[PDB]
C-alpha cells in the first residue's frame, strides 16, 4: 500500500464533501466524481489526477455524489434539496432532477438494477423514487432527527442522528448504540455487504457489524478509539472493506478480525467520505481540509 498526498486544491480550497468512482468502467483508467462546496461538480480522470468535466448545475453546495451500478447515470445531491441525474474535456448533461427532499440531501443510495433511487436528506425522511418514472414512489419519515445514512440491500437500511438505526422492507421492519450530534462529520453512510448478508454501521467509539439473520444485536464491534468512524466503503469467498475515522483510514477483511491495514496522520481536518473503485486498485483518501491524497495498492486478491 502506497500513500501519495496531492498538493493541489480540487475546487480552489473548498472543503471536501463527497466522492464517487465510476463502477461501470471495467478497465484500469478510473473516473472520479468530485462535487463539493464550490457549488459545482467536477469530473476528474485518475490513473495521477486529470480534470475532465465541470458541471455547475447545483445552485448550492453538493454533499453527496454517487452513480448507478451501470456507471451511466450519475446522481448529485446538493444543498438545493434537488438530486440531478447526469447522463452521457468531457460533456455532462443532466437527464432528470430527483426532487422530493424538504432539506439538504446528505446521503444518496442507488439500486443494483438501477430502476430505483434511495435518498437521504436533513428533512428527517427517506425518499425512494423510480428511475423509470423519475418521481418519488415511497417515503419513510420515521427519523426523528437529521438523516445522514441510507442504503439499499429485500430491505432498506436508514440511519439518522437520533442514535437509532431503521431497517425498512422495500414499512419499517426493525429498529436498533450511537452518540449525539457531537460528531463534527456530516456523513454517517452505512455500508451493506456486496452480497447483502452483512451490514456495517459506523458512529457507534466502535463500528458494529450485523448479519442478515439478526440485525438487532451485532455479534462483533470494531472499536475506533480516539477518532470516530464516519464512512464505510467495501471493495466491489472473502471481501475487503474500508472504514474512515475522523482522521484515520482503516481497511478490514472478511476473515481477519483485526484491521488489515491502518492509515492515519495524513490530513489536518475531519475525514469526509470513504469510497473504492470498480477495480479496487485506485482509492484516493482525503479529509475536509480542502486537499486530496491518494492511496494505491496492488496484490488484488482476484
Amino acid at each position: 500500500m502506497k500513500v501519495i498526498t496531492c498538493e493541489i486544491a480540487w475546487h480552489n480550497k473548498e472543503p471536501v464533501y463527497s466522492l464517487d468512482f465510476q463502477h461501470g468502467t471495467a478497465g484500469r483508467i478510473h473516473r472520479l466524481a468530485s462535487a463539493g462546496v464550490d457549488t459545482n461538480v467536477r469530473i476528474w480522470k485518475v490513473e495521477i489526477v486529470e480534470f475532465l468535466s465541470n458541471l455547475a448545475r447545483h445552485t448550492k453546495a453538493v454533499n453527496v455524489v454517487r452513480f448507478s451500478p451501470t456507471g451511466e447515470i450519475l446522481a448529485s445531491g446538493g444543498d438545493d434539496a434537488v438530486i440531478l441525474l447526469w447522463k452521457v474535456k468531457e460533456n455532462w448533461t443532466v437527464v432528470k432532477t430527483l426532487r422530493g427532499h424538504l432539506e439538504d440531501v446528505y446521503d444518496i443510495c442507488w439500486a443494483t438494477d438501477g430502476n430505483l433511487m434511495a435518498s437521504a436528506s436533513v428533512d428527517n425522511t427517506a425518499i425512494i423514487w423510480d428511475v423509470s418514472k423519475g418521481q418519488k414512489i415511497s417515503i419513510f419519515n420515521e427519523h426523528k432527527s437529521y438523516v445522514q445514512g441510507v442504503t439499499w440491500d429485500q430491505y432498506v437500511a436508514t440511519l439518522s442522528c437520533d442514535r437509532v438505526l431503521r431497517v425498512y422492507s422495500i414499512r419499517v421492519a426493525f429498529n436498533v448504540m450511537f452518540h449525539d450530534d457531537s460528531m463534527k462529520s456530516f456523513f454517517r453512510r452505512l455500508s451493506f455487504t456486496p452480497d447483502g448478508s452483512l451490514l456495517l454501521t459506523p458512529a457507534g467509539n466502535t463500528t458494529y457489524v450485523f448479519s442478515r439473520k439478526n440485525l438487532k444485536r451485532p455479534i462483533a464491534h470494531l472499536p475506533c478509539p480516539g477518532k470516530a468512524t464516519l464512512a464505510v466503503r467495501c471493495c466491489p469467498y472473502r471481501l475487503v472493506f474500508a472504514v474512515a475515522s475522523e482522521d484515520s483510514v482503516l481497511l478490514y477483511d472478511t476473515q481477519q478480525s483485526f484491521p488489515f491495514g491502518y492509515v492515519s496522520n495524513i490530513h489536518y481536518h475531519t475525514l469526509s467520505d470513504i469510497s473504492w473503485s470498480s477495480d479496487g486498485a485506485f482509492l484516493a483518501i482525503s479529509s475536509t481540509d480542502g486537499y486530496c491524497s491518494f492511496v494505491t495498492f496492488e496484490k488484488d486478491e482476484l
Binding site: 500500500m1 502506497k2 500513500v3 498526498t5 466502535t206 455479534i219 462483533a220 464491534h221 470494531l222 472499536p223 478509539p225 482503516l250 478480525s257 483485526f258 484491521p259 488489515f260 491495514g261 491502518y262 492509515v263 492515519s264 496522520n265 495524513i266 492511496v295 495498492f297 496484490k299
Partner: peptide, 15 residues
C-alpha cells in the same frame, strides 16, 4: 504519512 502493509492488535475486535 503512516502506512501499514497488508499483514494492529491494539485495534483488535472485542466481542
Amino acid at each position: 504519512p503512516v502506512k501499514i502493509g497488508c499483514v494492529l492488535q491494539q485495534f483488535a475486535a472485542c466481542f
